């Protein structure tokens, strides 16, 4: 016998199965974008700009999702700002300067916020009537590190007053503030925040810059075309496998998986990386379902071993259905090796593989704990549950398609650097807070919050609160890990960051976790992969 198949079909159908680029439009957009690209550049390279105007300019270009065209110009400008470390005396500009620098690795001192606090060390209540200042302080409070205790109350301060003033603010500011209170910029998925900013805010700004707005809308729509091609290509791939019929117990969420990959990196140069990444997320999805929604203690034990040995010869050692899965997994990695041959980078594929073996080992342990009704101590729980988030694995995977990834980068990653650990913790801890009830009602007493309660002898509330501070501490670690000098180039840190951002966005709703599939993601998928921004 097997467990009752619940998982419902993909509410997407074949919307993405086939998409044909309109080359006429693509070139038209590309061609004009090129022009707008140079106009914008000259805006950045312009001399005699005030500090406030330069920062607002960088900020706007970043929120518009077009800053990836000016990585160097923006860096040079911020570098120069960091060194001359001149002091503007208004909250708004100081909080912005602080955020932009810190997000870019410049360890600017949080001492810049001293002039805004009293002797006691708390923010001057007299700032409560400066909305723009409160807003930028709010966004800034989210990039603090363990050494920014000066900003310990910045979040509660800016929050309370922003909530209070919001109802009477003019649009789009009102919407910008309300949105920020629901999702800070630093911890949001880049494409999602860019889509919202472009069409809900900047397109309605009275003072909007038309060149920047047009540039932003065209670029976003153009990249979307690329994304739709990829998702189409990946959708055909998923169809050929046909697990929907061979492995009926498995969920069909390739679209949701693509969204995840898109959140890791959206730039066109990462097109190959994205395709490779989504294929892996989809594949490891089957394995998860197989472990906790179908396979028996005995089959899983054999599956785990087959994965560790990793050789087709083991396929016969597995039951018929696990053969479909297993065979598909091996071929996938064989495809990766073939894709990287061109650039002679097939030798890194093994790193992703050892990470998958790790995920499978821990899944198996997870079920063994389930079967025995074992409720481990938090430490033992995390030693296993961290890897089952698959984050070490996805992070490793995201490097595969990155042309610039070197063995050194993978070596650094293999040691579980602090920035990656933090990202993993955030996923684990946020998931456990969101999926406690459900898993608890299925006998999964080896669930995070559970272990925490028994371990510490505290209520479900104190346990979730404990987990929140872990997520909080973890975010501080991520922010610290982005400060220069970085152990690897920032290009390889951003994906870890983005993985954590995906977490915050997929479980924004702890009030139910909200059926991850449909709810939560559906809106974003429609906004990033279905509807183009109306010009
Ligand atoms: C933190 C964890 C482990 C999962 C939720 C967040 C993540 C990283 C999702 C992507 C990994 C995949 C493809 C799953 F199927 C994950 O499986 P499940 O979301 O249906 O749920 P459980 O494995 O926690 O039972
Ligand atoms: Mg599982
Ligand atoms: Mg599951
Ligand atoms: Mg859980």
Q: Which domain CATH number covers 257?
A: 1.10.600.10
Q: Are residues 171 and 234 in the same domain?
A: no
Token look-up 């998986």 returns 257
375 and 512 fall within a common domain: yes
Count how many domains the chain has.
Answer: 2
Which run of H or of E encompasses 226? helix 210-241
For residue 25, the Cα-to-chain-centroid distance in whole angstroms is 30
Q: Tell me if 168 sits within 8 A of 123, measured CB to CB.
A: no
Resolution in Å, one decimal place:
2.5
Structural biology method used: X-ray
Q: Are residues 391 and 504 in the same domain?
A: yes
Domain co-membership, 403 together with 318: yes
- 513 CB-contact burial (10 Å; exposed 0-12 / middle 13-18 / buried 19+): buried
Q: Among 23, 20, 29, 22, which Cα is nearest to 221's?
A: 29
Half-sphere exposure of 230 (CA within 13 A, CB side): 26
Q: Does 59 share its domain with 18?
A: no
Task: State yes or no: is 251 an active-site residue.
Answer: yes
Q: Are residues 221 and 283 in the same domain?
A: yes
**440 and 303 fall within a common domain:** yes
Tokens of 74: 């923006």
Can you give the three-state secondary structure of 340-406, one letter per residue?
HHCCCCHHHHHHHHHHHHHHHHHHHHHHHHHHHCCCCCHHHHHHHHCHHHCHHHHHHHHHHCCCCCC
Alpha-carbon gap, residue 379 to 383, rounded angstroms: 6
Distance 514 CA to ligand 1 centre (A): 14
41 & 52 share domain: no
Assess contact for 360 and 329: CB atoms under 8 A: no
Instruction: Establish whether 316 is an annotated binding residue.
Output: no
Final residue belonging to a domain, choices 207, 235, 268: 207
Question: Which of 181, 207, 233 is at the close of a domain?
Answer: 207
432 appears as a binding residue in the annotation: yes
Give the phi and the psi of residue 521 in degrees, each rounded to 5: -80, -40
Residues 35 and 137 in one domain: no
392 and 311 fall within a common domain = yes
Q: Measured from the CA of 253, which atom of ligand 1 is nearest?
A: 13
Give the N- to C-terminal CA distance of the chain in Å, as an integer. Answer: 56
* Nearest one of 309, 266, 264 to 499, comparing CA atoms: 264
Give residue 208 CA to ligand 1 midpoint distance, Å: 41
Report CA 50 to chain centroid distance, whole Å: 34
Q: Which of 300, 429, 431 to mutate to test the pocket of ligand 1 (most atoms within 8 A of CB)?
A: 431
C-alpha to C-alpha distances, 160 to 130, 202, 268, nearest whole angstrom: 13, 25, 40
Q: Which of 159, 176, 207 is the last residue of a domain?
A: 207
Instruction: Please list the residues that pair with 123 across neighbouring strands.
Output: 117
Which ligand 1 atom is at minimum distance from the Cα of 427? 1
Question: Quick one: 386 and 468 in the same domain?
Answer: yes
Beta carbons of 194 and 64 less than 8 angstroms apart: yes
- Across the strands, what pairs with 117? 123
The DSSP code sequence of 149-210 is GGGTTHHHHHHHHHHHHGGGPPTTHHHHHHHHHHS-STTS-HHHHHHHIIIIIGGG-TT--H
- Would you state the structure tokens that stand for residue 265, as one six-digit string? 């990196």
Q: Domain span at residue 431?
A: 4-47+208-534
Tell me how crowded residue 430 is: count the other CB atoms within 10 A of its CB: 24
Q: Which atom of ligand 1 is nearest to the CA of 257?
A: 13
Distance 427 CA to ligand 3 centre (A): 14
Between the alpha carbon of residue 449 and those of residues 440, 469, 508, 511, the distances in Å are 9, 13, 18, 15
Q: Rounded to an integer, what distance in angstroms lies between the CA atom of residue 83 and that of residue 106?
A: 10
Which residues surround ligand 1 with Cβ inside 6 Å?
A: 281, 284-285, 288, 292, 388-390, 427-428, 431
Q: Extract long-range pairs of 46-52: CB within 8 Å, 24+ residues apart.
A: 51/81, 51/86, 51/88, 51/93, 51/97, 52/88, 52/92, 52/93
Q: Distance from CA of residue 390 to its chain's centroid? A: 13
Cα 197 to Cα 177: distance, rounded to the nearest angstrom: 11
Same domain, 312 and 174: no
In contact, 388 and 362? CB cutoff 8 Å: yes
Q: Read off the tokens for 312.
A: 């087709």
Q: How would you class 227 by CB atoms within 10 Å of its CB: exposed for 0-12, middle for 13-18, buried for 19 or more? A: buried
Separate counts of helices (H) and strands (E) for the chain: 24, 0
């Amino acid at each position: 016998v097997r467990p009752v198949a619940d998982f419902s079909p993909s509410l997407w159908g074949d919307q993405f199965l086939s998409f044909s680029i309109k080359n006429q439009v693509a070139e038209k957009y590309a061609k004009e974008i090129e022009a707008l690209k140079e106009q914008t550049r000259n805006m950045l390279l312009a001399t005699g700009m005030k500090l406030a105007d330069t920062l607002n300019l960088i900020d706007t270009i970043e929120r518009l999702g077009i800053s990836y065209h000016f990585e160097k110009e923006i860096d040079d400008i911020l570098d120069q700002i960091y060194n001359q470390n001149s002091n503007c005396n208004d909250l708004c500009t100081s909080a912005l300067q602080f955020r932009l620098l810190r997000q870019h690795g410049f360890n600017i001192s949080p001492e810049i916020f001293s002039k805004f606090q009293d002797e006691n060390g708390k923010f001057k209540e007299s700032l409560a009537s400066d909305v723009l200042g409160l807003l930028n302080l709010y966004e800034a409070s989210h990039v603090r590190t363990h050494a920014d205790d000066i900003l310990e109350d910045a979040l509660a301060f800016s929050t309370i007053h922003l909530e209070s003033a919001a109802p009477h603010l003019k649009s789009p500011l009102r919407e910008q503030v309300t949105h920020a209170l629901e999702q800070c910029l630093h911890k949001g998925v880049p494409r999602v925040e860019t889509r919202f900013f472009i069409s809900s805010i900047y397109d309605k700004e009275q003072s909007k810059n038309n060149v920047l707005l047009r540039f932003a809308k065209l670029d976003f729509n153009l990249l979307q075309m690329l994304h739709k091609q990829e998702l189409a290509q990946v959708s055909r791939w998923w169809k050929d496998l046909d697990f929907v019929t061979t492995l009926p117990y498995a969920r069909d969420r390739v679209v949701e998986c693509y969204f995840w990959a898109l959140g890791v990196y959206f730039e066109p140069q990462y097109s190959q990386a994205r395709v490779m990444l989504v294929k892996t997320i989809s594949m490891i999805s089957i394995v998860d379902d197989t472990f906790d929604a179908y396979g028996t203690v005995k089959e899983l034990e054999a599956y785990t071993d087959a994965i560790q040995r990793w050789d087709i010869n083991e396929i016969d050692r597995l039951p018929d259905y696990m053969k479909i899965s297993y065979k598909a997994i091996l071929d996938l990695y064989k495809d990766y090796e073939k894709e990287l041959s061109s650039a002679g980078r097939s030798h890194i594929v093994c790193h992703a593989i050892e990470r998958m073996k790790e995920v499978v080992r821990n899944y198996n342990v997870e079920s063994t704990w389930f079967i025995e009704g074992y409720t481990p101590p938090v430490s033992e729980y995390l030693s296993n549950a961290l890897a089952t988030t698959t984050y070490y694995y996805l992070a490793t995977t995201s490097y595969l398609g990155m042309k610039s990834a070197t063995e050194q980068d993978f070596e650094w990653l293999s040691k579980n650097p602090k920035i990656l650990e933090a990202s993993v913790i955030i996923c684990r801890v946020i998931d456990d807070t969101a999926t406690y009830e459900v898993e608890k009602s299925r006998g999964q007493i080896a669930t995070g919050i559970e272990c925490c309660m028994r371990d510490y002898g505290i209520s479900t509330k104190e346990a979730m609160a404990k987990f929140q501070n872990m997520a909080e501490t973890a975010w501080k670690d991520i922010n610290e890990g982005l400060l220069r000098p970085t152990p690897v180039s920032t290009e390889f840190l951003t994906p870890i960051l983005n993985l954590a951002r995906i977490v915050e966005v997929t479980y924004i709703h702890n009030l139910d976790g909200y059926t991850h599939p449909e709810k939560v993601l559906k809106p974003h998928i429609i906004n990033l992969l279905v509807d183009s921004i109306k010009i």
